[PDB]
XYZ file of C-alpha atoms in Angstrom:
78
model
C 337.046 302.535 18.681
C 338.321 305.971 18.701
C 336.063 308.742 19.851
C 338.087 312.330 18.862
C 340.828 313.128 21.320
C 340.654 309.274 22.505
C 341.441 309.691 25.936
C 338.518 307.607 26.626
C 339.992 304.738 24.766
C 340.803 301.313 26.393
C 341.786 299.228 23.463
C 344.487 296.839 22.929
C 346.725 298.839 20.365
C 350.466 298.503 21.221
C 351.604 299.637 17.766
C 352.365 303.336 16.380
C 351.625 304.915 13.232
C 354.711 303.525 11.590
C 354.861 299.927 12.592
C 356.680 300.609 15.948
C 355.656 298.950 18.791
C 354.626 300.660 22.314
C 356.836 300.440 25.415
C 355.658 299.657 28.832
C 353.930 302.537 30.397
C 355.838 301.170 33.226
C 359.039 300.913 31.603
C 361.950 303.346 30.628
C 364.597 301.078 29.088
C 364.483 302.609 25.578
C 363.159 306.112 27.357
C 362.670 307.546 30.455
C 359.215 309.007 30.494
C 357.486 310.344 33.464
C 353.909 309.179 32.314
C 353.129 306.574 34.714
C 349.849 305.162 35.947
C 351.228 306.848 39.082
C 351.469 310.193 37.340
C 348.166 309.360 35.537
C 346.338 307.424 37.473
C 343.121 307.621 36.101
C 344.108 307.156 32.533
C 343.901 303.458 31.426
C 347.688 303.304 31.331
C 348.526 299.497 31.337
C 350.900 297.218 29.670
C 352.113 298.713 26.402
C 348.687 300.242 24.726
C 348.079 303.496 22.653
C 346.814 305.884 24.819
C 346.183 309.551 25.616
C 346.821 310.406 29.378
C 347.422 314.323 28.128
C 344.494 316.011 26.579
C 346.276 315.119 23.279
C 344.682 314.578 19.840
C 344.515 311.063 19.922
C 346.220 307.890 21.689
C 349.786 307.883 21.904
C 352.638 305.522 23.261
C 356.587 305.866 23.733
C 358.503 303.963 21.732
C 360.612 301.039 21.832
C 362.701 302.576 19.091
C 365.843 304.410 20.159
C 365.300 306.451 17.500
C 361.738 307.223 18.208
C 360.951 308.459 21.913
C 357.269 307.844 21.186
C 354.564 308.608 18.565
C 350.933 308.424 17.458
C 348.899 305.352 16.857
C 346.859 304.303 13.961
C 343.165 304.029 15.116
C 339.800 304.916 13.352
C 337.760 307.733 14.538
C 334.346 306.715 15.473
């Protein structure tokens, strides 16, 4: 569900703390990240899910919103 940093997470949450939908951890149309399964192999970096390949706080994603690079995702701690 969510265990602290939550780098450990492998849910199906493709939506952010603002109703945004997550960009493909593969894609780059809205924004040119550099945070790929290639770059971050060992992180369940698939489709468009909420995640934390960095020792970040809790699962993030890259936004599909041209105004919004990326942003946090609303998952409950556990």
